[PDB]
Amino acid sequence: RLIYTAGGYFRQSLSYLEAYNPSDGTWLRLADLQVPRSGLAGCVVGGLLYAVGGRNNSPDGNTDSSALDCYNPMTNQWSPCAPMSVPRNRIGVGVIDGHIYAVGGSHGCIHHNSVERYEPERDEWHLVAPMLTRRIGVGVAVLNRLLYAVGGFDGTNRLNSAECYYPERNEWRMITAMNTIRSGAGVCVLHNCIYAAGGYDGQDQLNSVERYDVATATWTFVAPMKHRRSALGITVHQGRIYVLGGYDGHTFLDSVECYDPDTDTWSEVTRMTSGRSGVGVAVT
Ligand SMILES: Nc1nc(=S)[nH]c2[nH]ncc12
């Protein structure tokens, strides 16, 4: 299984689809996205990779995206899917059962608190209960069939709050806030904790990382990353976290760091073929 990077940003929005193998270290280049996008999210349902939302920043325009697009790794082809009800740049995305949840994001000055659900087998989106908060640059993660929206930006304030979506009830409820304000952090599930790595707090990009334990309902810092980064890509592969690219306040990183929880340590594991931020990332 590989870690896929889709889209991203470096001087403009990118179409690159590339896969890194932490086992042999190789980067293999696959089919370009139909439309370049940064600020998108990636996920996998039934082994198919989806690209959700984002934005095409080019010298000729800046268009937020409603597009959902699907990649088959054995056939190397993108297929357009039904679009969301609104464009969602800097979207968050999570998967519960077999449905794709599109969370937050922006459309111009509009900062969404709305959430939509996609059924890959029916190719339909439907609006779901909105969050308590407007959130662009939000991290989304799923634990025990529960959907977490973590941090982000409401248009005026960067956020340390997190809220939890209950599918059976169709309602959101706040949880304990993170210790650190973070928009554009990488958010994932590793074991039985929600991790939030990096981001931007409104003054600096962050290298700190913290994790949420649902049993105790508390957030705890762990070892920081080596590079401060916002708008990083994050995923979990064989019980380890990977962060891909991002921005440190000066440069777009190609650095890829890997966190080992048993040792609570980060190590640089590779460089992307080119620096970028705002990628979608998933594993299949
Ligand atoms: N790196 C940054 N991330 C966010 S979300 N906002 C920012 N303003 N200026 C830098 C950044």
UniProtKB/Swiss-Prot annotation:
Kelch repeat start-end pairs: 2-47, 48-98, 99-145, 146-192, 193-239, 240-284
Chain segments annotated as transmembrane: none
Post-translational modification: Non-enzymatic covalent modifications of reactive cysteines by electrophile metabolites inactivate the BCR(KEAP1) complex. Accumulation of fumarate promotes the formation of cysteine S-succination (S-(2-succinyl)cysteine), leading to inactivate the BCR(KEAP1) complex and promote NFE2L2/NRF2 nuclear accumulation and activation. Nitric oxide-dependent 8-Nitro-cGMP formation promotes cysteine guanylation (S-cGMP-cysteine), leading to NFE2L2/NRF2 nuclear accumulation and activation.
Positions where S-cGMP-cysteine occurs in the chain: 109
Result when mutating residue 105 to C: In a lung adenocarcinoma patient; somatic mutation; strongly reduces interaction with NFE2L2/NRF2 and reduces repression of NFE2L2/NRF2-dependent gene expression
Location within or outside the cell: Cytoplasm; Nucleus
Tissues where this protein is expressed: Broadly expressed, with highest levels in skeletal muscle.
Coiled-coil segments on the chain, per record: none
Record site: Sensor for electrophilic agents: 109
Function: Substrate-specific adapter of a BCR (BTB-CUL3-RBX1) E3 ubiquitin ligase complex that regulates the response to oxidative stress by targeting NFE2L2/NRF2 for ubiquitination. KEAP1 acts as a key sensor of oxidative and electrophilic stress: in normal conditions, the BCR(KEAP1) complex mediates ubiquitination and degradation of NFE2L2/NRF2, a transcription factor regulating expression of many cytoprotective genes.
Recorded domain comment: KEAP1 contains reactive cysteine residues that act as sensors for endogenously produced and exogenously encountered small molecules, which react with sulfhydryl groups and modify the cysteine sensors, leading to impair ability of the BCR(KEAP1) complex to ubiquitinate target proteins.
Annotated family: Belongs to the KEAP1 family.
Oligomeric form and interacting partners: Component of the BCR(KEAP1) E3 ubiquitin ligase complex, at least composed of 2 molecules of CUL3, 2 molecules of KEAP1, and RBX1. Interacts with NFE2L2/NRF2; the interaction is direct. Forms a ternary complex with NFE2L2/NRF2 and PGAM5. Interacts with (phosphorylated) SQSTM1/p62; the interaction is direct and inactivates the BCR(KEAP1) complex by sequestering it in inclusion bodies, promoting its degradation. Interacts with NFE2L1. Interacts with BPTF and PTMA. Interacts with MAP1LC3B. Interacts indirectly with ENC1. Interacts with SESN1 and SESN2. Interacts with HSP90AA1 and HSP90AB1.
Entry protein name: Kelch-like ECH-associated protein 1
Protein's organism: Homo sapiens
Gene name as annotated: KEAP1
From-to range in the entire protein, with total length: 326 to 609 of 624
